[PDB]
Symmetry: C3
Subunit: 56 residues, 3 copies
Amino acid sequence: GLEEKVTRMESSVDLLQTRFARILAEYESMQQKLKQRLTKVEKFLKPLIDTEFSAI
Amino acid sequence: GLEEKVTRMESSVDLLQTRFARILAEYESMQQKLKQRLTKVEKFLKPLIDT
Amino acid sequence: MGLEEKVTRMESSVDLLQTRFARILAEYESMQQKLKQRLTKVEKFLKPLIDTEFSAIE
Ligand SMILES: [Zn+2]
Ligand SMILES: [Zn+2]
């Protein structure tokens, strides 16, 4: 019965990794979009930032 | 012998899954707050930033 | 032979799972802190600038 249990556990752990992989992929994809958005904001503001702090 | 080892691996997976669920939940919640904050900021700069 | 072999392989898979994720978790905390710092600088610059130069934007 033990070998049966461990055989099944293999597929269960595989299922878990597949779930995890997708949840992570989605988190990272969103993280990626926030960075892109943030970077556009920083680029847009760069001239204003420099106007406040950097001569010439 | 092997029964106790397998039991211990079941518990490890259990703990790991639980750590994952809770920790990813805390990261997703913080990510939402960052999105909200970024959306406010962008609202100030529209429609200029989009153009 | 079959049983012991599965137990051995399973031990290794579970170790790998736990290590992989300790590593992913470290990258997240790092990228999230950096994102927060960047956003915070933007916010801290933009509020007083709006207030003093571009006031109707609010
Ligand atoms: Zn100025
Ligand atoms: Zn091990």
